[PDB]
Design a protein around this ligand. Structure first.
Ligand SMILES: O=C1Nc2cccc(OC3CCNCC3)c2/C1=C/c1ccc2[nH]cnc2c1
Ligand SMILES: [Zn+2]
Length: 313
């Protein structure tokens, strides 16, 4: 628990104190819980909600929009991703990512908003960024060498049948775009991704995560470690055992997600996705009241230390 690279408890406690669960849940989560398929009005409001929420933050992220067209198993659809980079002159960054679109389902069925998939994750990032705003604003001003980059991806889903030409429209393009952009050192923006941490299927009760890439397993250990740790310093609601979320040790793997286009380009990936998937997954039942708010908040706290331990805040 008093290991190496770790937060002096004092700070960690303030780090956690600063998180506002009412804000996570209602400023940030509640608004997104809406049908938001590609290029639908649903979509575009979320897109603009994020596009703003990020800009208002005091530390003044560079918020830029990656938009495009693509050929689907339906018409052409247009998409826009949301790239938010706290200090883009900085030479590397930690890229956290998630997708704001929602899976189009056939009509005449209870709309599908997908709370775990991926409403909850998006809001976790919004909270991270806001509950850590002064501290990022410090290090940004300190021309810190590794900054923070947040991706809110569009078009992960699939209209019709899931497959390599219908899925991950957004990541596939963002990746395409990044490697075409000279950065320094680099050579591309793609190499500026120190870690690509990807959040998915989050907020159902009683998840289990495993390391899925052994190249990043040590970071996964940070998380198991940060879980302990918060349990010990009593800062976890409904957490009987010491190890609940972050399991040992190193299983099989692969589960096509937004990381893939980056991983094709050699990007170290940490796939923070519950496995087994939420019971309610891809049903009209992915909805605000199946979430397990304690779990939702433990994962805010657990990430919110990690962020800090990572960027030394
Ligand atoms: O988006 C998706 N549509 C499908 C239709 C049929 C099967 C599917 O996935 C495989 C079988 C079940 N276990 C492993 C993957 C998917 C799928 C996969 C997937 C992966 C990650 C996701 N994050 C949010 N939605 C996701 C779906
Ligand atoms: Zn999905």
């Amino acid at each position: 628990v008093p290991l190496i690279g770790s937060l002096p408890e004092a700070r960690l406690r303030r780090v956690v104190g600063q998180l506002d669960p009412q804000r996570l849940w209602s400023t940030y989560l509640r608004p997104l819980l809406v049908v938001r398929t590609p290029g639908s009005p649903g979509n575009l409001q979320v897109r603009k909600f994020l596009e703003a929420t990020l800009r208002s933050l005091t530390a003044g992220w560079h918020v830029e929009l990656d938009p495009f067209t693509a050929s689907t198993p339906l018409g052409p659809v247009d998409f826009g991703n949301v790239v938010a980079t706290l200090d883009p002159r900085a030479a590397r960054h930690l890229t956290l990512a998630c997708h704001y679109d929602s899976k189009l389902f056939p009509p005449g069925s209870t709309p599908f908003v997908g709370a775990t998939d991926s409403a909850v994750p998006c809001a976790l990032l919004l909270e991270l960024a806001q509950a850590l705003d002064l501290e990022l604003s410090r290090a940004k001003k300190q021309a810190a060498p590794v900054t923070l980059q947040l991706l809110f991806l569009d078009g992960e889903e699939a209209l019709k049948e899931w497959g390599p030409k219908d899925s991950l429209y957004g990541s596939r393009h963002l990746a395409q775009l990044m490697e075409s952009i000279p950065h320094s050192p680099g050579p591309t923006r793609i190499q500026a991704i120190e870690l690509f941490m990807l959040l998915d299927l989050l907020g159902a009760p009683n998840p289990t995560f495993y390391s899925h890439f052994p190249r990043t397993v040590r970071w996964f250990h940070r998380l198991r470690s940060i879980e302990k740790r918060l349990h010990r310093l009593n800062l976890l609601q409904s957490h009987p055992q010491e190890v609940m979320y972050f399991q040992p040790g190193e299983p099989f793997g692969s589960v096509e997600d937004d990381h893939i286009p980056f991983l094709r380009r050699g990007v170290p990936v940490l796939h923070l996705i519950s496995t087994p998937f939420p019971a309610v997954w891809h049903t009209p039942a992915d909805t605000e009241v199946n979430l397990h708010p304690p779990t939702v908040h433990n994962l805010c706290r657990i990430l919110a230390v990690f962020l800090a331990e990572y960027l030394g805040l």
